[PDB]
Amino acid sequence: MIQRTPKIQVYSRHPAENGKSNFLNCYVSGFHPSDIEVDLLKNGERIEKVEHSDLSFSKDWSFYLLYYTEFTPTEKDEYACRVNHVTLSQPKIVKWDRDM
Amino acid sequence: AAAKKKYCL
Amino acid sequence: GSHSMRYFDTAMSRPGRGEPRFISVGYVDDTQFVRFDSDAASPREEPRAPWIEQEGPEYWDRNTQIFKTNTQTDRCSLRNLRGYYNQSEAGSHTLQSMYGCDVGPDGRLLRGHNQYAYDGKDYIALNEDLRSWTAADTAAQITQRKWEAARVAEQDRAYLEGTCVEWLRRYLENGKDTLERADPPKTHVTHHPISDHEATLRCWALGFYPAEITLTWQRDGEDQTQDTELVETRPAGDRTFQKWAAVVVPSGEEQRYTCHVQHEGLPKPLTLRWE
């Protein structure tokens, strides 16, 4: 069976401003098959109230999902997305960088 | 309905 | 401009973990308006769009029943496919389908779609004629034979030329303040030194709808396709989309680069530079 590894992007809904409420997104796309594990992290800790979009896929059949949660960026706090998939040897961690 | 009745492959 | 309605259905087996999950999600362009998930506590056609909430309970019930029957049909299909490929009952497999119609500005049919993939590979597709099938391999030739004997393509054609186009036109009218409104991208260029010798220019497009957009960098008017990093267009979670394109520029040569943005929301194509 062909398998495709996820592309992962971590970003905010609106451009980030310290101390102002926002949503942290982790977009996983291009993967197959559809089972995937996504966590949003705040200083390495799993955030609990995380929502996700309904599973769908693009015209080339690869799946995508958006995982999101409300957050308030600050100079101090670090955020990230950790992803696991059958195609990955170990979980992949992509840190939130406000310039990507 | 907007959904379509599907057929078994 | 032009519009599409499309359903994207995923059925996935999970031996030892119950029957296969079926989820079906419908979109007009890049707006989801319905979801059905067989694993939802009470499976029902569920509105994902305020303009659909406007349809009466009979619409809901009619579609709910089509989705429930489709869940059983997709499970039938997954059992038949496992056998067509001589696969064992132990493994998980995935059947996907996409169907729906595209219409132009006048609402007339541009083309219909009904196609399937198994384990991420194309399996069978209704041709653009809406009368014949293209099968990927000898297993899909069995489905093609069954569907030719049963005159399935005619039922599909009737849906695609009738029901699908009629509902898309109705959704476009009830949803016109959102479905027919293109939001242009808010654009800007950012600069990030890498070293003394180079820096990144990143050209941003934010807050746009629909998702189709083209972002390119030119050096002295020449497209830098090969040297541009383009990220997949991504959803913001408030209906709009974001994208950027970056190129690594020799220090002092920033003004030789221009970012070009085309989007249906813009009165005219944008050309942007650093500062």
Residue numbers in the entry:
A (entry chain B): 0 to 99
B (entry chain C): 1 to 9
C (entry chain A): 1 to 275
Task: Show passages lifted from the paper.
We determined the crystal structures and thermostability of a set of N-terminally extended peptides bound to HLA-B*0801, and monitored the trimming of these peptides by ERAP1 both in their free and MHC I–bound forms. To eliminate possible issues with peptides dissociating from the HLA-B*0801 groove during trimming by ERAP1, we introduced a Lys-to-Cys mutation at P7 in AAKKKYKL and also introduced the complementary Glu76 → Cys mutation in HLA-B*0801. Based on AAKKKYCL, we produced the nested set of N-terminally extended 10-, 12-, 14-, and 20-mer peptides (RA)nAAKKKYCL that can be covalently bound to HLA-B*0801E76C. Our structures revealed that the N-terminally extended peptides bind into the MHC I groove by adopting noncanonical conformations with residue extensions protruding out of the A pocket.
To understand how a N-terminally extended 10-mer peptide is presented by HLA-B*0801, we determined the X-ray crystal structure of (R(N-Me)A)AAKKKYCL covalently bound to HLA-B*0801E76C at 1.65 Å. The structure surprisingly shows that the peptide adopts an elongated conformation in which the AAKKKYCL core is bound into the groove, and the residue extensions P−1 (N-Me)Ala (one position N-terminal of P1) and P−2 Arg protrude out at the A pocket. The electron density was well-defined over the entire length of the peptide, including the extension P−1 (N-Me)Ala, although no electron density at an acceptable 1σ threshold could be discerned for the N-methyl group of P−1 (N-Me)Ala and P−2 Arg. The P−2 Arg residue was therefore omitted in our model. Comparisons with a previously reported canonical structure of GGKKKYKL bound to HLA-B*0801 (42) showed that the peptide backbones adopt nearly identical conformations, except for a small 0.71-Å shift in P1 Cα-atom positions. Remarkably, only minor structural changes in the binding groove were detected between the two structures (r.m.s. deviation of 0.46 Å, over 1–180 Cα positions), except for residue Arg62. In the canonical structure of GGKKKYKL, the side chain of Arg62 acts as a lid atop of the peptide N terminus, whereas in our structure, this residue swings out and up, which “opens” the A pocket. In this “open” configuration, P−1 (N-Me)Ala and P−2 Arg can extend straight out of the groove. A close-up view of the A pocket shows that the side-chain methyl group of P1 Ala is rotated and occupies the position of a canonical N-terminal group of bound peptide structures. In our structure, because of the lack of a peptide N-terminal group, there are noticeable changes to the conventional network of H-bonds normally seen within the A pocket: H-bonds to conserved Tyr7 and Tyr171 residues are absent, and a new H-bond is formed between the main-chain nitrogen of P1 Ala and Asn63.
